[PDB]
Design a protein around this ligand. Structure first.
Ligand SMILES: [Zn+2]
Ligand SMILES: [Zn+2]
Ligand SMILES: [Zn+2]
Ligand SMILES: [Zn+2]
Ligand SMILES: [Zn+2]
Ligand SMILES: [Zn+2]
Ligand SMILES: [Zn+2]
Ligand SMILES: [Zn+2]
Ligand SMILES: [Zn+2]
Ligand SMILES: [Zn+2]
Ligand SMILES: [Zn+2]
Length: 523
């Protein structure tokens, strides 16, 4: 009477686990390993999963999709990987009904990842329990295909790409059809995700495939407009894989069929991103990622924002988001006794600005090093390299997406945030998922303060489209973003009325969107 029991889904009955919480009757129903699509075929679109007899025991996480290990030496996962997981919070009087539903999409550069995430202190990163119970929402996590098996493409109908995006869409569609049986409101689905998962969230809101399926969305440190998201030259990367695995490269149709019958582990390990040193910046080796296929992604994403006109939207970034790519591109920023020089930074900047030639390199170098005259310290110079990568990879694309979403909004509300703290401790995921409460020995009181506020905003937003209005109190009134106010919430360990700010790095936003674009293209 206060828990779900066997749940009737379209494929048949599903039985999960009930976990009693606290002393006074609360609990949480946990389902792991519900199939939402058939066992996958290499480089083919996902298909419906056949129904089953009896009661499916949804007791354990299922295998992730076949992917390279972090050493890039071998693989793990399996072709049979399109499974999802559900947390349903339960009160002490009766079973929950009409709850907001939040669907998480993990990141990992479209190359790695699973629905449970990394395990640390006996706790999976994307364990939805804390969000679900603290926010009174349902949380869904799931697997999608990554790497070459998720995104290999010829740029044409022989191998159209975007298999992993279709996987995500199939999980969303399954949730819309089935989640009411678990106590969810299918008209109130919020997607949220980080990095590649935030770009995926963005792409799902822009795809006509999701018409009528999505109510709201949250992009964390990634949008469809980020430069690492759309592969402009997929045939080049498909040919690189073909050559490594022994497929001919003269005919696209012959190459595509050969790739489809190659050992999927060989496809997965065909290319390895060199650690160091690289000839180009890290951004250059972003390979197997979404493409404009004229189908799932019908056009350049900048042109698709009418599809999100009635999808409420949060988008934000982390203060130091670019530091991973910056550390690869300029290792000196790690070692305290190693200098970054004007010459090193010019070189990096010139790699990013090649299409506008010498002039574009200089104008960019000049604007980012303007402060180096008064402050030539290595602290300021290394911060400049990180801010540069953060701007071009995350912040500027996020600000353009916010402006595009606002300009196309009908009923949709738009919100912006900047997360500033103090894996790495500066990252937003662990606070969104409430890890400071799930493994409190690894965290300080101020961390639980931050996580409490983020879960309040996120789940208020899921419930109502208004991060300030819902089951939870918030520390700062989060004002909706407009072109006029260009406001963002700065999320930190102590928030108050001044945490609502405006015009984040607008001189740099204006440089990239007006000044740099006004420069003549060079060939
Ligand atoms: Zn199955
Ligand atoms: Zn696993
Ligand atoms: Zn297998
Ligand atoms: Zn109802
Ligand atoms: Zn569909
Ligand atoms: Zn390049
Ligand atoms: Zn170059
Ligand atoms: Zn980070
Ligand atoms: Zn992150
Ligand atoms: Zn902290
Ligand atoms: Zn207001």
């Amino acid at each position: 009477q206060s828990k779900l029991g066997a749940v009737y889904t379209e494929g048949g009955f599903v039985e999960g686990v009930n976990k009693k919480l606290g002393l006074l009757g609360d609990s949480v129903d946990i389902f792991k390993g519900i199939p939402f699509a058939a066992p996958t075929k290499a480089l083919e679109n996902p298909q419906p999963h056949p129904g089953w007899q009896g009661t499916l025991k949804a007791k354990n996480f299922k295998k992730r999709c076949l992917q390279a290990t972090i050493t890039q030496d071998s693989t793990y996962g399996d072709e049979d990987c399109l499974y999802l997981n559900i947390w349903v919070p339960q009160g002490r009087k009766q079973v929950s009904r009409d709850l907001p539903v939040m669907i998480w999409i993990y990141g990992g550069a479209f190359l790695m990842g699973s629905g449970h995430g990394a395990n640390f202190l006996n706790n999976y990163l994307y364990d939805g329990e804390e969000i679900a119970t603290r926010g009174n929402v349902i949380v869904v996590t799931f697997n999608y295909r990554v790497g070459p098996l998720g995104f290999l493409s010829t740029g044409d109908a022989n191998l159209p790409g975007n298999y992993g995006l279709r996987d995500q869409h199939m999980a969303i569609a399954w949730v819309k059809r089935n989640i009411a049986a678990f106590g969810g409101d299918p008209d109130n689905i919020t997607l949220f995700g980080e990095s590649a998962g935030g770009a995926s969230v963005s792409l799902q809101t822009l795809s006509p495939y999701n018409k009528g399926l999505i109510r709201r969305a949250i992009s964390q440190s990634g949008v469809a407009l980020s430069p690492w998201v759309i592969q402009k030259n997929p045939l080049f990367w498909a040919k690189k894989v073909a050559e490594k695995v022994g497929c001919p490269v003269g005919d696209a149709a012959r190459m595509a069929q050969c790739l489809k019958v190659t050992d999927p582990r060989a496809l997965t390990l065909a290319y390895k991103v060199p650690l160091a040193g690289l000839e180009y910046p890290m951004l250059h080796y972003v390979g197997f990622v979404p493409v404009i296929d004229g189908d799932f992604i019908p056009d350049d994403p900048i042109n698709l924002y009418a599809n999100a006109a009635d999808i409420d939207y949060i988008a934000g970034t982390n203060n130091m988001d670019g530091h991973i790519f910056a550390s690869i591109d300029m290792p000196a920023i790690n070692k305290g006794n190693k200098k970054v020089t004007e010459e090193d930074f010019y070189k990096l900047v010139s790699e990013f600005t090649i299409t506008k030639g010498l002039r574009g390199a200089k104008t960019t170098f000049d604007v980012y090093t303007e402060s180096w005259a008064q402050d030539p310290s290595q602290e300021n110079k290394k911060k400049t390299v990180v801010d540069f990568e953060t701007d071009v990879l995350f912040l500027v694309p996020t600000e353009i997406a916010l402006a595009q979403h606002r300009a196309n909004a009908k009923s949709a509300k738009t919100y912006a945030y900047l997360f500033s703290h103090p894996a790495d401790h500066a990252d937003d995921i662990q606070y969104v998922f409430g890890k400071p409460f799930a493994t409190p020995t690894g965290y300080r009181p101020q961390d639980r303060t931050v996580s409490k506020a983020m879960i309040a905003y996120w789940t208020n937003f899921a419930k109502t489209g208004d991060p300030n209005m819902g089951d939870s109190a918030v520390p700062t009134h989060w004002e909706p973003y407009t072109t006029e106010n260009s406001g963002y919430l700065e999320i930190t360990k102590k928030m108050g009325s001044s945490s609502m700010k405006r015009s984040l790095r607008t001189n740099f936003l204006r440089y990239w969107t007006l000044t740099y674009l006004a420069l003549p293209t060079v060939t």
